[PDB]
Amino acid sequence: ELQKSIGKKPEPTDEEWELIKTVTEAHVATNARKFLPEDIGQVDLEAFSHFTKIITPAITRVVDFAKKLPMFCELPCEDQIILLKGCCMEIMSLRAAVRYDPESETLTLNGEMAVTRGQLKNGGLGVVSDAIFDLGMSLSSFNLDDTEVALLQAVLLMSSDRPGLACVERIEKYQDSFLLAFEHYINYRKHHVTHFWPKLLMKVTDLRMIGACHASRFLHMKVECPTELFPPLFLEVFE
Numbered sequence: 427e428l429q430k431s432i433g434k435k436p437e438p439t440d441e442e443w444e445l446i447k448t449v450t451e452a453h454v455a456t457n458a459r460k461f462l463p464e465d466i467g468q469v470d471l472e473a474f475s476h477f478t479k480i481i482t483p484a485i486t487r488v489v490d491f492a493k494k495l496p497m498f499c500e501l502p503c504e505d506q507i508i509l510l511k512g513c514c515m516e517i518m519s520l521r522a523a524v525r526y527d528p529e530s531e532t533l534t535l536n537g538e539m540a541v542t543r544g545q546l547k548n549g550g551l552g553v554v555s556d557a558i559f560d561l562g563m564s565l566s567s568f569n570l571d572d573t574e575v576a577l578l579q580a581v582l583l584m585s586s587d588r589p590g591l592a593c594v595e596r597i598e599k600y601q602d603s604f605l606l607a608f609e610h611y612i613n614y615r616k617h618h619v620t621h622f623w624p625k626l627l628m629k630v631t632d633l634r635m636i637g638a639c640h641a642s643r644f645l646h647m648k649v650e651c652p653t654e655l656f657p658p659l660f661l662e663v664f665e
């Protein structure tokens with residue numbers, strides 16, 4: 427914070443280089459093409475089908491990342507549950523968004539399937555599609571590596587704001603540790619875009635929205651499409 431007054435812009439402590447070693451390994455371990463015909467999407471029940479055939483593995487990989495982080499494993503059992511449930515979609519939207527490519531204008535879902543904005547949207551996501559795309563478009567320019575996505579993810583995971591969490595103080599603290607190892611890692615990367623870090627923290631807000639905006643969306647679907655249509659893990663994590 428005095429280093430912050432002098433504009434010293436520090437790079438990570440050795441102790442911190444550990445944290446970066448782990449989240450990037452946890453992340454690369456679990457981050458994983460085929461264009462889904464313009465045929466599908468163009469509620470579409472066939473777009474519905476194709477995107478829920480593949481979401482159960484996506485969710486486990488997001489869990490497998492949290493398992494690989496040891497700060498996560500220090501938490502009581504009902505708290506672990508609660509975090510995973512919160513960021514599950516948040517983490518998931520980012521993971522897709524950074525795999526935008528503007529030539530085709532497609533994301534890559536689950537690391538295989540390549541969807542346009544209308545295709546993802548018509549399978550039941552509505553504006554939650556537009557949010558994940560608009561985002562991936564903006565992150566085109568930020569040029570994130572596995573380590574930054576990893577840390578962003580680890581910031582999302584450790585969100586003491588979740589309803590019914592018990593170990594708030596400790597989780598918050600863990601989070602500040604990722605944010606500090608993250609900001610120091612940005613400093614170290616020297617990105618050519620003024621206020622890179624402020625700009626990047628607003629992506630946390632937008633991802634937080636998407637997750638929310640997806641839960642609401644999921645209530646509009648529960649109405650018309652019965653619960654029977656939904657992969658049992660998806661249900662356990664979004665209900």
Ligand SMILES: Oc1ccc(Oc2c(Br)cc(CC(O)O)cc2Br)cc1C(O)NCCc1ccccc1
Binds near residue numbers: 484485518537550
């Ligand atoms: O719910 C979803 C969540 C993610 C999704 O795309 C993905 C998938 Br699949 C996986 C991931 C993680 C990854 O890319 O590895 C991100 C994203 Br974005 C597609 C749907 C989807 O089309 N389901 C529609 C049924 C439904 C569910 C919730 C709300 C509204 C409608």
